[PDB]
Amino acid sequence: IVGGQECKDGECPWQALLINEENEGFCGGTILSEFYILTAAHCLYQAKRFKVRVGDRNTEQEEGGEAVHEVEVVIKHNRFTKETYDFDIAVLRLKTPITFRMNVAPACLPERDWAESTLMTQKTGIVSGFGRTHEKGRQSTRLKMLEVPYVDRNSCKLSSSFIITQNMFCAGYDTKQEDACQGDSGGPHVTRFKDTYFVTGIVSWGEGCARKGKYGIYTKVTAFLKWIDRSMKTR
Amino acid sequence: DQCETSPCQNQGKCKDGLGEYTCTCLEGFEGKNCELFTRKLCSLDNGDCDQFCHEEQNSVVCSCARGYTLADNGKACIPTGPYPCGKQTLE
Numbered sequence A: 001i002v003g004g005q006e007c008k009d010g011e012c013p014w015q016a017l018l019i020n021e022e023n024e025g026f027c028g029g030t031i032l033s034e035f036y037i038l039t040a041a042h043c044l045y046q047a048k049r050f051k052v053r054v055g056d057r058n059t060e061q062e063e064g065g066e067a068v069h070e071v072e073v074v075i076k077h078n079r080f081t082k083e084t085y086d087f088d089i090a091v092l093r094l095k096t097p098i099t100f101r102m103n104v105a106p107a108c109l110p111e112r113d114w115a116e117s118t119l120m121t122q123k124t125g126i127v128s129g130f131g132r133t134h135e136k137g138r139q140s141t142r143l144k145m146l147e148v149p150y151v152d153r154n155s156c157k158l159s160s161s162f163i164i165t166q167n168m169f170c171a172g173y174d175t176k177q178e179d180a181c182q183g184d185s186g187g188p189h190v191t192r193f194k195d196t197y198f199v200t201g202i203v204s205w206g207e208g209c210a211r212k213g214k215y216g217i218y219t220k221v222t223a224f225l226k227w228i229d230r231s232m233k234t235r
Numbered sequence B: 001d002q003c004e005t006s007p008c009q010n011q012g013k014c015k016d017g018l019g020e021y022t023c024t025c026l027e028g029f030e031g032k033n034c035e036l037f038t039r040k041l042c043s044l045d046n047g048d049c050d051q052f053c054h055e056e057q058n059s060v061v062c063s064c065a066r067g068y069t070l071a072d073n074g075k076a077c078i079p080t081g082p083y084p085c086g087k088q089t090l091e
């Protein structure tokens, strides 16, 4: 995360972290339940073997209060496109049930029609992660968060050098030095309504980080709410 | 005289009080002069639902995300289990 701030305790409890073979976090995710994790499809191809670490809030010091779970199964969108990053969404069914606790709790999945009118129409959303604190910098020590204004498709598309499909949306600032970044990918984009946080986007990609003229690109989760429930009703 | 002006609307009943009139609203009207609708669709205040709102026959119907049960009043959502979704964690 570039800009923003560190999450306070129990503030971004739906934040999961995919760690590679070297227990190095390489992508974020969103706890959907005690067994499922929402992530980006492209993240499924950046580690030979990965696990899911939740409750973790400082990658350097082992404060504890966290846990690593083995992925029983991985459900990627059969339409994921490596070149455009369209259909960039996935769900991982854990081998062991997450034990919700302080800093480990799920984010609500909204109802499609209601999300598009009551959430997606809001002024801002919240994206978090252990990504990079600058395009060139390194991954942050502690979990961070950022409030990113929703951007209109038109403006989004006119700013992109890559196609913005309908399974995507923009969020962030034109020139303000704040945005998501590598490492935050797959992570949560949440929108609050009456103090309840609903999953609204997945950190997909962007042209750099906090780069003037450009924004961050996320996977419009509303287009996949039916897909998700499907995936979530498995083995 | 307070009621001489018949300040009430929607067939409400003006009833001059101590030193001020009063309107006893009909079913579905409120406010000092029964000039407001008590019935509001999802467009206004989310129809008073705590979470999801939707209309069914020109009438609001609330709902909640899994892990929640709709209050008996038909609006509020009550977390059934220990760590309901979308809520930050305490303790």
Ligand SMILES: N=C(N)c1cccc(-c2cccc([C@H](CCCNc3ccncc3)C(=O)O)c2)c1
Binding pocket: A082, A083, A084, A085, A162, A179, A180, A181, A182, A183, A184, A185, A203, A204, A205, A206, A207, A208, A209, A210, A215, A216, A217
């Ligand atoms: N600012 C953000 N919101 C953002 C968020 C997460 C990641 C990145 C990012 C930053 C630099 C390089 C890469 C690359 C991504 C390579 C694919 N690039 C595209 C571009 C257009 N369509 C499909 C794929 C990386 O993964 O290292 C990704 C930017």
Ligand SMILES: [Ca+2]
Binding pocket: A056, A057, A058, A059, A060, A061, A062, A063, A064, A066
């Ligand atoms: Ca730690």
Ligand SMILES: [Ca+2]
Binding pocket: B002, B016, B017, B018, B019, B020
């Ligand atoms: Ca009087």
